[PDB]
Amino acid sequence: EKGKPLMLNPRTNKGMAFTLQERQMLGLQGLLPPKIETQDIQALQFHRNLKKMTSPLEKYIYIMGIQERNEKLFYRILQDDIESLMPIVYTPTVGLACSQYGHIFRRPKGLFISISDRGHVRSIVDNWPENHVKAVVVTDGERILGLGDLGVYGMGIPVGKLCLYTACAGIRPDRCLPVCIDVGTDNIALLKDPFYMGLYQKRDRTQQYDDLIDEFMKAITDRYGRNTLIQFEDFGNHNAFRFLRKYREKYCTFNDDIQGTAAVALAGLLAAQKVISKPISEHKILFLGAGEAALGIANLIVMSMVENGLSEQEAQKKIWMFDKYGLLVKGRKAKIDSYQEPFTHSAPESIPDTFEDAVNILKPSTIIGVAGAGRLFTPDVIRAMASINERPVIFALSNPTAQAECTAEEAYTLTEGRCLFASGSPFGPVKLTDGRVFTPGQGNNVYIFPGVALAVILCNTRHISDSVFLEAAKALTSQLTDEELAQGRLYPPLANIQEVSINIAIKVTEYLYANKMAFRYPEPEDKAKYVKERTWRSEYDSLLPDVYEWP
Amino acid sequence: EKGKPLMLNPRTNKGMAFTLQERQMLGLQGLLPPKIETQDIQALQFHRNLKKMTSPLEKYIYIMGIQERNEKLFYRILQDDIESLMPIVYTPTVGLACSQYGHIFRRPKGLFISISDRGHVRSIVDNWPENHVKAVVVTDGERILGLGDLGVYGMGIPVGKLCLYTACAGIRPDRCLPVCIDVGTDNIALLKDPFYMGLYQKRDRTQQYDDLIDEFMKAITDRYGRNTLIQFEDFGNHNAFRFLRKYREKYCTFNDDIQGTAAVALAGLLAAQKVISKPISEHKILFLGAGEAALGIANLIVMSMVENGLSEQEAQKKIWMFDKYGLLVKGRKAKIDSYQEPFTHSAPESIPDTFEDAVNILKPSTIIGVAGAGRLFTPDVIRAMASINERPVIFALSNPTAQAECTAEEAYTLTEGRCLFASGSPFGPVKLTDGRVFTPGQGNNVYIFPGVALAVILCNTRHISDSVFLEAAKALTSQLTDEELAQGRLYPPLANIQEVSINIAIKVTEYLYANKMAFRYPEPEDKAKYVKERTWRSEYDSLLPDVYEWP
Amino acid sequence: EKGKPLMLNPRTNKGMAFTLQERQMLGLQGLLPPKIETQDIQALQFHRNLKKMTSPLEKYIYIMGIQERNEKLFYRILQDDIESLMPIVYTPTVGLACSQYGHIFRRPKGLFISISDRGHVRSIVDNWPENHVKAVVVTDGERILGLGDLGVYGMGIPVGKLCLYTACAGIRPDRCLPVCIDVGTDNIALLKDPFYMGLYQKRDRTQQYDDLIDEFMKAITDRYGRNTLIQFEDFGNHNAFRFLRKYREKYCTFNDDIQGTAAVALAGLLAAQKVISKPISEHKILFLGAGEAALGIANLIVMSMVENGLSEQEAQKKIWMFDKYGLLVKGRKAKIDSYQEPFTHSAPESIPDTFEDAVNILKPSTIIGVAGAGRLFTPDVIRAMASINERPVIFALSNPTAQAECTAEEAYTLTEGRCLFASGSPFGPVKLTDGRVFTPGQGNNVYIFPGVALAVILCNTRHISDSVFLEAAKALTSQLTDEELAQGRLYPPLANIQEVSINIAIKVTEYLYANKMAFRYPEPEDKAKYVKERTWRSEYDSL
Ligand SMILES: NC(=O)c1ccc[n+]([C@@H]2O[C@H](COP(=O)([O-])OP(=O)(O)OC[C@H]3O[C@@H](n4cnc5c(N)ncnc54)[C@H](O)[C@@H]3O)[C@@H](O)[C@H]2O)c1
Ligand SMILES: NC(=O)c1ccc[n+]([C@@H]2O[C@H](COP(=O)([O-])OP(=O)(O)OC[C@H]3O[C@@H](n4cnc5c(N)ncnc54)[C@H](O)[C@@H]3O)[C@@H](O)[C@H]2O)c1
Ligand SMILES: NC(=O)c1ccc[n+]([C@@H]2O[C@H](COP(=O)([O-])OP(=O)(O)OC[C@H]3O[C@@H](n4cnc5c(N)ncnc54)[C@H](O)[C@@H]3O)[C@@H](O)[C@H]2O)c1
Ligand SMILES: NC(=O)c1ccc[n+]([C@@H]2O[C@H](COP(=O)([O-])OP(=O)(O)OC[C@H]3O[C@@H](n4cnc5c(N)ncnc54)[C@H](O)[C@@H]3O)[C@@H](O)[C@H]2O)c1
Ligand SMILES: NC(=O)c1ccc[n+]([C@@H]2O[C@H](COP(=O)([O-])OP(=O)(O)OC[C@H]3O[C@@H](n4cnc5c(N)ncnc54)[C@H](O)[C@@H]3O)[C@@H](O)[C@H]2O)c1
Ligand SMILES: NC(=O)c1ccc[n+]([C@@H]2O[C@H](COP(=O)([O-])OP(=O)(O)OC[C@H]3O[C@@H](n4cnc5c(N)ncnc54)[C@H](O)[C@@H]3O)[C@@H](O)[C@H]2O)c1
Numbered sequence A, B: 001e002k003g004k005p006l007m008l009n010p011r012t013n014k015g016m017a018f019t020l021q022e023r024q025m026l027g028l029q030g031l032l033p034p035k036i037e038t039q040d041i042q043a044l045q046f047h048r049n050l051k052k053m054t055s056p057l058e059k060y061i062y063i064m065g066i067q068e069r070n071e072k073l074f075y076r077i078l079q080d081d082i083e084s085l086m087p088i089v090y091t092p093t094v095g096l097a098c099s100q101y102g103h104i105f106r107r108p109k110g111l112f113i114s115i116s117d118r119g120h121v122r123s124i125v126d127n128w129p130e131n132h133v134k135a136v137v138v139t140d141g142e143r144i145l146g147l148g149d150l151g152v153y154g155m156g157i158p159v160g161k162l163c164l165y166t167a168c169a170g171i172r173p174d175r176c177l178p179v180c181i182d183v184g185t186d187n188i189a190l191l192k193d194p195f196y197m198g199l200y201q202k203r204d205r206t207q208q209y210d211d212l213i214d215e216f217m218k219a220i221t222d223r224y225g226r227n228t229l230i231q232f233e234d235f236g237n238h239n240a241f242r243f244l245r246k247y248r249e250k251y252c253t254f255n256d257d258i259q260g261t262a263a264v265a266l267a268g269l270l271a272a273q274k275v276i277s278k279p280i281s282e283h284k285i286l287f288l289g290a291g292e293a294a295l296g297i298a299n300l301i302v303m304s305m306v307e308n309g310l311s312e313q314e315a316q317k318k319i320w321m322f323d324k325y326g327l328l329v330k331g332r333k334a335k336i337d338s339y340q341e342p343f344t345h346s347a348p349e350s351i352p353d354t355f356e357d358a359v360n361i362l363k364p365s366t367i368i369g370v371a372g373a374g375r376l377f378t379p380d381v382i383r384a385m386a387s388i389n390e391r392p393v394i395f396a397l398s399n400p401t402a403q404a405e406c407t408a409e410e411a412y413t414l415t416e417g418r419c420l421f422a423s424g425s426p427f428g429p430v431k432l433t434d435g436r437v438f439t440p441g442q443g444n445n446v447y448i449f450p451g452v453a454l455a456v457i458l459c460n461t462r463h464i465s466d467s468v469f470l471e472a473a474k475a476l477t478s479q480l481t482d483e484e485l486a487q488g489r490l491y492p493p494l495a496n497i498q499e500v501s502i503n504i505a506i507k508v509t510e511y512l513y514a515n516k517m518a519f520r521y522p523e524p525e526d527k528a529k530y531v532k533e534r535t536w537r538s539e540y541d542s543l544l545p546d547v548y549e550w551p
Numbered sequence C: 001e002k003g004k005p006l007m008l009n010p011r012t013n014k015g016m017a018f019t020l021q022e023r024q025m026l027g028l029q030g031l032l033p034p035k036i037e038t039q040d041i042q043a044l045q046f047h048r049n050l051k052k053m054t055s056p057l058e059k060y061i062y063i064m065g066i067q068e069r070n071e072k073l074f075y076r077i078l079q080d081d082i083e084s085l086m087p088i089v090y091t092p093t094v095g096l097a098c099s100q101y102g103h104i105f106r107r108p109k110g111l112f113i114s115i116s117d118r119g120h121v122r123s124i125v126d127n128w129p130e131n132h133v134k135a136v137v138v139t140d141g142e143r144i145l146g147l148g149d150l151g152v153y154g155m156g157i158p159v160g161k162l163c164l165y166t167a168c169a170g171i172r173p174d175r176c177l178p179v180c181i182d183v184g185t186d187n188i189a190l191l192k193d194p195f196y197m198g199l200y201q202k203r204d205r206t207q208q209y210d211d212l213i214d215e216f217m218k219a220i221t222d223r224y225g226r227n228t229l230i231q232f233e234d235f236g237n238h239n240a241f242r243f244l245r246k247y248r249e250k251y252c253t254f255n256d257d258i259q260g261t262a263a264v265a266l267a268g269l270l271a272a273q274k275v276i277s278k279p280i281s282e283h284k285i286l287f288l289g290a291g292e293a294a295l296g297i298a299n300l301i302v303m304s305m306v307e308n309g310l311s312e313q314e315a316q317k318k319i320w321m322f323d324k325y326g327l328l329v330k331g332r333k334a335k336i337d338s339y340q341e342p343f344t345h346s347a348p349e350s351i352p353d354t355f356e357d358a359v360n361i362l363k364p365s366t367i368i369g370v371a372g373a374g375r376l377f378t379p380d381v382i383r384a385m386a387s388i389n390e391r392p393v394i395f396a397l398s399n400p401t402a403q404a405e406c407t408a409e410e411a412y413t414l415t416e417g418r419c420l421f422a423s424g425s426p427f428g429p430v431k432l433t434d435g436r437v438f439t440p441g442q443g444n445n446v447y448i449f450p451g452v453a454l455a456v457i458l459c460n461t462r463h464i465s466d467s468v469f470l471e472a473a474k475a476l477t478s479q480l481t482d483e484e485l486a487q488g489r490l491y492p493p494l495a496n497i498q499e500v501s502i503n504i505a506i507k508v509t510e511y512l513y514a515n516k517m518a519f520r521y522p523e524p525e526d527k528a529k530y531v532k533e534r535t536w537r538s539e540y541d542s543l
Helices: A004-008 A020-026 A039-050 A056-067 A071-080 A082-089 A093-105 A121-125 A151-169 A207-224 A237-247 A256-275 A292-306 A312-316 A355-362 A379-388 A408-413 A449-458 A466-477 A482-486 A494-514 A527-532 B004-008 B020-026 B039-050 B056-067 B071-080 B082-089 B093-105 B121-125 B151-169 B207-224 B237-247 B256-275 B292-306 B312-316 B355-362 B379-388 B408-413 B449-458 B466-477 B482-486 B494-514 B527-532 C004-008 C020-026 C039-052 C056-067 C071-080 C082-089 C093-099 C121-127 C151-169 C207-224 C237-247 C256-276 C292-307 C312-316 C355-362 C379-388 C408-413 C449-458 C466-478 C482-486 C494-514 C527-532
Strands: A111-114 A135-139 A176-182 A229-232 A285-288 A319-323 A366-369 A393-396 A420-423 B111-114 B135-139 B176-182 B229-232 B285-288 B319-323 B366-369 B393-396 B420-423 C111-114 C135-139 C176-182 C229-232 C253-255 C285-288 C319-323 C366-369 C393-396 C420-423
Touching: A039 A056, A039 A071, A056 A071, A056 A082, A056 A093, A071 A082, A071 A151, A082 A093, A082 A151, A082 A494, A093 A151, A111 A121, A121 A207, A135 A151, A135 A207, A151 A176, A151 A449, A151 A494, A176 A207, A229 A237, A229 A449, A237 A256, A237 A292, A256 A292, A256 A366, A256 A393, A256 A420, A256 A449, A256 A466, A256 A482, A285 A292, A285 A355, A292 A312, A292 A319, A292 A466, A319 A355, A355 A379, A379 A408, A408 A420, A449 A466, A449 A494, A449 A527, A466 A494, A494 A527, B039 B056, B039 B071, B056 B071, B056 B082, B056 B093, B071 B082, B071 B151, B082 B093, B082 B151, B082 B494, B093 B151, B093 C039, B111 B121, B121 B207, B135 B151, B135 B207, B151 B176, B151 B449, B151 B494, B176 B207, B229 B237, B229 B449, B237 B256, B237 B292, B256 B292, B256 B366, B256 B393, B256 B420, B256 B449, B256 B466, B256 B482, B285 B292, B285 B355, B292 B312, B292 B319, B292 B466, B319 B355, B355 B379, B379 B408, B408 B420, B449 B466, B449 B494, B449 B527, B466 B494, B494 B527, C039 C056, C039 C071, C056 C071, C056 C082, C056 C093, C071 C082, C071 C151, C082 C093, C082 C151, C082 C494, C093 C151, C111 C121, C121 C207, C135 C151, C135 C207, C151 C176, C151 C449, C151 C494, C176 C207, C207 C237, C229 C237, C229 C449, C237 C253, C237 C256, C237 C292, C253 C256, C256 C292, C256 C366, C256 C393, C256 C420, C256 C449, C256 C466, C256 C482, C285 C292, C285 C355, C292 C312, C292 C319, C292 C466, C319 C355, C355 C379, C379 C408, C408 C420, C449 C466, C449 C494, C449 C527, C466 C494, C494 C527
Parallel strands: A111 A176, A135 A176, A135 A229, A285 A319, A285 A366, A366 A393, A393 A420, B111 B176, B135 B176, B135 B229, B285 B319, B285 B366, B366 B393, B393 B420, C111 C176, C135 C176, C135 C229, C229 C253, C285 C319, C285 C366, C366 C393, C393 C420
Antiparallel strands: none
16 A cells, blocks of 8 residues: 555654655655655654643644644654653543533544444444454543543543553554443533534433443454453443443453552552551551442452461451441441441441541551542541651542542641652642652552553453452552652652553563463563563654565 | 556556566565566567467467456557457457357456346446446347357457457557447357356347437446447347437447448449549449448448549449349339439339349449348359459458358459459458469458547547548558559558558548547647557556655 | 455455345446356356366366456365365376466466565565465475476465365465475476576575575564464475474474375374284384385374384384385494484394395385385285285385386285285276275375364464374374275275365364463364364355
8 A cells, every 4th residue: 555545544654754765665755845854853843842832732632633643653752751741641631622622623533332323333343444452441421530421522531541551551552442432411511512423312321321331342342352451431430330340250341440549559558668667467547438449449458468478357457447427337327338348347445426536546557538528638637647657648549639538738737747648639749847848649540551451462361350450559669769769759750651551561461371361372481571572662664665686 | 556456457467577676666576476577578478379279269268368467468469460360359259259158267348238227227337447438339249240149248249349449549448348238139059058147038129129229328428428439249230220320410339330341342442443443434333232231332432433523413323233122223113212212223224133134234343242142143243244344343242251242262263363352251362274363352340440430539529420431441542552552452451450540540530620520629730640649559657666866 | 345356356256146236235237247146056057167178287277267266166166076176276287287387377376485585585475465374385396296396387386285275174265375485496498498487597505595494484474473384395305304303393384295194194004903903013114215204104103103002112113114225224334314213223134135125034014115216016025015914004105106116906916905005196996806896095195284284273383293193194094984994995085075174173173272282262162163163165255
């Protein structure tokens, strides 16, 4: 294939980096201006132009323009300046982009499956032109973090996340399939817009909803394979969580809100445990929240303790949960689900009404907040920890920032800089009155999903075990240098997310083979060389035909 | 477009004549054996192989195999050895090929329009992939010369004739469309064959026949234009002749049996008139036959005399016709059609019963036989001419050989080598008893259809006048050299059919412009250079991309 | 995809059998005659046309004509009349067809890699349009059995063999890559030919040649994967045997003339054993030839014996070899390879000068002829075996009839119909004076290469062990029914080559999974169903 098509296909288009010989031999001569440049100077021109613009939204449009024009240039510039541009391509900007610029550019990307297509979903899946899809990321656009129900404009989130699959772990773009399921929207801003690109109905919440996600799962799987990696993104928590439970064993699926959070959470505790060298039986964890997030993080703490010499039942007894109804204790007015049982214990003689009370009586070394209620780590709660512990561990994991349990500012000032703090929220550094400055711990799911996704795909793995995320957690924290642990870092620098994501992938690859969950044989002797060699790269290929004389 | 497709398209395939650089740059390297040859040595290999085989049928299969593989090589070898291979590609072999090898190779070529497709013929025409069809040749396969009703196996005839359009006049192959109309067959050899490729019914002879040919004419014309050249080939004479009359004015159409015969016939008379210098009023023509052939040849004699100083009514009086019912004379038992009127005259006082009688009483300088009855030029008839004339002109034009009015052998022996003889039939040389050898005149429609077709297409002419064939006749005979006229040649050597066909085309081009029947403007100053420059040629083009350094 | 290309593509072209529905839908109405047919009518039409063709060479040209126009129809008619058309498409008439091919017709197919393309073999491999090649057959065409050095015209043989891969074992044609390596030719009649299609040079036998083969192996493997089955065919006996040794551990490779021959020979010997039940102790095998053919048969025989409770070197003691310098014996004047050593034994008191003398002293139960020197199984040799043995086994395997060690005629007559005889030659039935009628066994590599190939591809096997060929030999003989063994058949009928080939593929698949040589996971539970439902078929698809 030669001529114009080479230029209109972003997967092969090199633009001005088309060699003179390439332009002449492939019939491009005259279709480009008469000047050869390299990926280097192409990339340099873009970085320079991005430095002139200041709006994140404007940066999104500019860089997503390239992704449609020149695939390899897009992933060069993305990887050149990854810490700055991960927040532009993905959260928080992608959500802001979808909402505002859905109606104006109207450029279709990925696959749209509406409830109108019940019974014929296989035939919609058959229209996707790529034959070896390895990674599917799907949304119904119900809960875009910090905006809400954006309907089909949700498509932007799977696209953005897949960009990071490629940028961070070098997963092949052609092997990725962003999907948007349209069951309606509850947002009258969209239902009353004559220019809305989605179905004009309230979200279908009937059995037809559950049957369509079922049909989609079957359909993707029947074309691409049983081992096809599937993530649900910005679904309603109730849907996302019950779907993880329904499909986790039948399909190759994992969920960032539960399992990525658990890996990122544990990674941070493990980092905290390297500076504070506090012994295993000196440990007691108290959760604000007892939902799927708490259960997921808790499960992974239990499993970590069991690998370090404790017993499942010993590890469990070091973990307490406090939900809406208060502390979770054997025999109480409020419900206790059978997944919560393992962390529901015999009451201590004092029973608390507030979380503050619960801290004072239990005296935990670590509080983890996953309630999504708001500032429930109140100064009295933060103050009480500083009192009970030399170095208290305070994780305010609830997102977004409004829902977070406490700020970095109020966490560090009220413990006079002695707490080991992490959040999902982006808090800036905080300056105490003695002069010294604290940069808080920022837990980010991008630490986990790229490396995990790459290992599962490269191994042809069909089931993602809890131990994957355990192994992910250890792999992340094992990359913190002794110099970095002394400066109070709980998480590697995002600038190194590539090296980080690949080492996690090598270590999960090692785990999946060692435990007979890989189907890619023969098994490699060296798992490092196996992955470092199957990563997609942004360097331009030669498209030059091989001309040579005959001796 | 590059790679395998270049090789599977016979219009671009060069086979072993693909340059090393072409093979490397276009992605053919390894798809061909590792040896470069030229058209020269390709052509040489074929000629050498054809010399080892002796059956015309075997020569047909071998050479038609190339036409499907390598278009330009096919037209090189065809033109290299044109006198030998015109009879293989076309009549008489093509008819013999169709019959025998229709059922075995079963390779579809050209467009099939069946009576099953009444009302939807435009949509069948729309399936032909070439957009600028200039020349259409169509059969219903009813009367293959010297075989009969071959049904859809008739397709071979239009294909073969189009081969000669290209070989003889350099008309573009891509601009040619062979067509086969299937209305059934009356041949039970085909209707009882389970492997027959055509419709299983007797030929439809109802109004639906006339309506389908109408719909086909409209359809071809509505896609390709009003100026699109159309010939009917091996239709039943009644159909071929009444269709010429119905469409001749509405459409750009001409018929070889009537108009090609008239041009070839007149060309021969004009040649005879250069050696015998017998004056215009010393001339009297007697026809055996008074049908469309006689009328067509007669019309063109009248028009030739009128250009030389006679009057339409004077010229007519020099022409007599003798059909089944005898001599055509004002007031006789038998019918006289209004087209026959002009050559129906007042009776001479003796009235003949036999053609022999008619010769003796009228004493014509020329007898032309177009009756299709058989040996009606009996020795007494041939003898009577030798008696009445120093050099009698005897044209036995009825085809095939069985239907011919007399042989060359019996024509030359019974006039003791004094007759100027021509036939449509291929008679070998004839040796008289005084030693000397006569090569007879062979009239061949290939003298006329290539040159005429090229002029009409190159001029965007919409109507083919009688004067075209007049001009064709003069153009043919004007090419006989004075040396050739002394040896008794009535027709140029077939070995030079290319030069001959192109000069005819130049001279018809001159006529069509001079008489405002051309639509291609601006009109060229020099009509020779206009045609010599628009001829398709068999030389291979370069497909090499233009690689060059930048100064 | 649409219209004319759909007809010009032999993979898709159904010809007259394109349904009205398809024609309406795919823009074919008008491009085809009115008539609509079924594959049954096309095949029947074709079988009739072929029967009035007189020459086996005229037949080749007709059927290969269909192969270039309608691939489905080509494999239908081939499978329909598989026994008669097998020797048309392949051995022997493919060799004769090659001899006078590339002159009159000279259509190109497969992949041509020149010694001129040195260092650029990857370009050429990348020019092959198919993306999922699983089966490569390669030749340099130095040793076409019967004709010899046919240079670049040897391409016809890989093409011939891949046709049998598909016809016999239902290996997908679009996953087959015939390859001809052009390194020059020593054929003088062919170098002087101006219309020859190869390099006008003598065969490059330098290091450049060995490097080219290394580059080919690496190129095929880089594009299509390390799994890719690579089969060498009609290579020089010198190169084929040494390239097998070199590559068979590194890549997924086998050689038909060594490992295929070995497997078919053993299968015959094993069939002979069910008939006569000679106590394994009494077995004594004497080869005419000590070539890599003999070494391949010998290796598989000891593996059979070891598997039936003999120790390795105790089995080797039962096998004697005799070449151009007489019996292979310890401290002999002539030269012995390190692969010939295990079948080189201490000298018996009297050292045989002649093969007859070798038979009388050693008094063997079986004689295997693989010397390609002609009629060395002399009447006196055949009478000796008849006298020493109740049921003597005589295998005359030198392939071209004229250089077979003996005839069925000679074997059955001079043995009073007591001998179990196989050859590689197409000998007819033999009628003795006592009125009994003997049908000699025809050993044919087609019993093995199809089923083995399918199994290795389907199991994503990377190394093909000696045991695969031992298991294939056993799989072949087990196809023989009690009636067939009673009638004294040594091979199953060729008419059933498909069933035979697919049963062999199933047994080899079971062995490969059982011995951790299959890398296709998940492991199937029903191997017979796994293989049967993965075979490509001649049945037209819907478009
Ligand atoms: N590059 C292509 O255009 C292409 C397309 C189809 C097949 N192939 C060939 O087929 C052969 C078979 O593949 P294999 O099983 O050896 O692959 P593999 O064993 O190298 O990889 C194991 C699995 O991971 C996938 N994979 C590998 N690298 C990846 C990446 N960067 N992103 C996402 N997924 C990735 C594969 O599809 C496979 O499912 C390969 O040798 C390849 O050359 C190539
Ligand atoms: N903005 C968003 O898009 C969004 C929405 C929902 C959840 N989330 C995040 O995802 C996670 C999933 O939450 P979930 O589905 O388990 O919610 P849930 O209500 O099912 O469970 C959350 C837990 O917090 C507890 N809780 C609620 N209010 C409380 C209070 N005032 N005091 C103490 N405990 C209280 C609940 O009892 C429960 O145990 C949350 O941690 C949240 O950070 C984000
Ligand atoms: N060669 C191609 O692929 C192609 C296709 C379409 C259009 N064109 C271009 O469109 C322009 C317009 O054409 P034009 O009106 O000047 O043509 P023209 O005036 O040279 O020819 C007059 C007519 O005769 C036809 N013609 C010319 N040479 C012919 C041949 N060898 N056989 C049969 N028919 C022949 C033309 O189609 C036209 O109808 C041309 O300059 C040409 O380059 C080229
Ligand atoms: N074999 C074939 O495929 C075939 C078939 C028909 C015609 N042709 C040729 O095409 C031409 C067209 O013929 P047509 O359609 O005008 O036929 P027609 O019958 O319409 O006219 C032929 C003329 O010959 C005359 N004729 C017939 N028998 C005669 C006899 N015994 N004596 C004197 N005159 C006699 C007729 O009266 C008539 O004037 C013929 O000249 C013939 O050579 C060939
Ligand atoms: N189970 C069935 O009924 C059935 C039948 C036909 C195809 N399939 C296909 O098999 C797929 C499974 O994936 P896979 O292709 O990796 O496993 P597979 O079992 O189809 O592959 C086995 C190996 O042999 C190859 N192969 C299979 N059939 C072949 C043939 N006839 N000729 C040559 N090579 C052949 C394959 O490329 C692969 O390397 C399914 O997605 C399905 O589409 C399944
Ligand atoms: N069984 C089958 O279906 C099958 C298949 C393919 C090939 N073959 C045959 O395998 C044979 C291999 O032999 P090759 O010709 O390639 O030579 P080779 O070098 O492979 O082996 C021939 C052996 O015979 C010996 N030899 C030569 N002349 C001799 C003589 N007069 N007496 C005793 N020994 C002699 C040689 O020294 C050598 O040891 C071929 O003849 C070929 O026809 C058989």
